[PDB]
C-alpha cells in the first residue's frame, strides 16, 4: 500500500495561473504523482490534466 502514488483532497478551490498549475475543486481530489518533492506537489486529474498544486491547501487521502 505504497506505490509512491496516492490521492489528495483540495480543501479550497485553487485555480491555475498557467498549464503549469492544475485547477483544484473543493472536496474534489486528484492523483498524486510527485510526492517526494517538497517545493510543489504534482497532481493529475482523471481528465488527463496535470499541474503543480499546493500541498498546504490540501491533505493526503491514501488508498482505500
Swiss-Prot record:
- Where is it made, tissue-wise? Is detected in the thymus, lymph node and very faintly in the spleen, but is not detected in the liver, lung, kidney, heart, brain, intestine or testis. Expressed in T-lymphocytes and mast cells. It may also be expressed in natural killer cells.
Changes after translation = Subsequent autophosphorylation at Tyr-12 leads to the kinase activation. The autophosphorylated Tyr-12 lies within the substrate binding sequence of the SH3 domain. Ubiquitinated.
* Similarity comment text for this entry: Belongs to the protein kinase superfamily. Tyr protein kinase family. TEC subfamily.
Domain (SH3): residue spans on this chain: 3-63
Cellular location(s): Cytoplasm; Nucleus
Q: Which residues carry this modification: Phosphotyrosine?
A: 12
- What is seen without this gene? Mice display decreased mature thymocytes and elicit profound defect in CD4+ and CD8+ T-cell development. Additionally, they show a strong decrease of cytokine production in response to TCR receptor stimulation. Impaired TCR-mediated calcium response in gamma-delta T-cells. Loss of Vgamma2-positive immature thymocyte-specific transcriptomic profile, although there is no change to overall transcription factor expression levels. Not required for the generation of IL17A expressing gamma-delta T-cells.
Inducing or repressing factors: Through a myriad of surface receptors including the TCR/CD3 signaling complex, coreceptors, or chemokine receptors.
Superkingdom: Eukaryota
Quaternary structure note = Homooligomerizes; this association negatively regulates kinase activity. Interacts with PPIA/CYPA; this interaction regulates TCR signal strength via a proline-directed conformational switch in ITK. Interacts with THEMIS. Interacts with FASLG. Interacts with VAV1; this interaction is important for VAV1 localization and TCR-induced actin polarization. Interacts with TBX21.
Please provide the record's free-text comment about the domains of this protein.
Answer: The N-terminal PH domain allows ITK to be recruited to the plasma membrane by an activated PI3 kinase. This domain also contains a proline-rich region (PRR). The adjoining domain is a SH3 domain, which binds to PRR (from itself or from other proteins). Next, a SH2 domain is required for binding tyrosine-phosphorylated substrates. In the C-terminal region, the kinase domain is required for tyrosine phosphorylation.
Explain the purpose of this protein: Tyrosine kinase that plays an essential role in regulation of the adaptive immune response. Regulates the development, function and differentiation of conventional T-cells and nonconventional NKT-cells. When antigen presenting cells (APC) activate T-cell receptor (TCR), a series of phosphorylation lead to the recruitment of ITK to the cell membrane, in the vicinity of the stimulated TCR receptor, where it is phosphorylated by LCK. Phosphorylation leads to ITK autophosphorylation and full activation.
Protein name from the UniProt record: Tyrosine-protein kinase ITK/TSK
Species source reads: Mus musculus
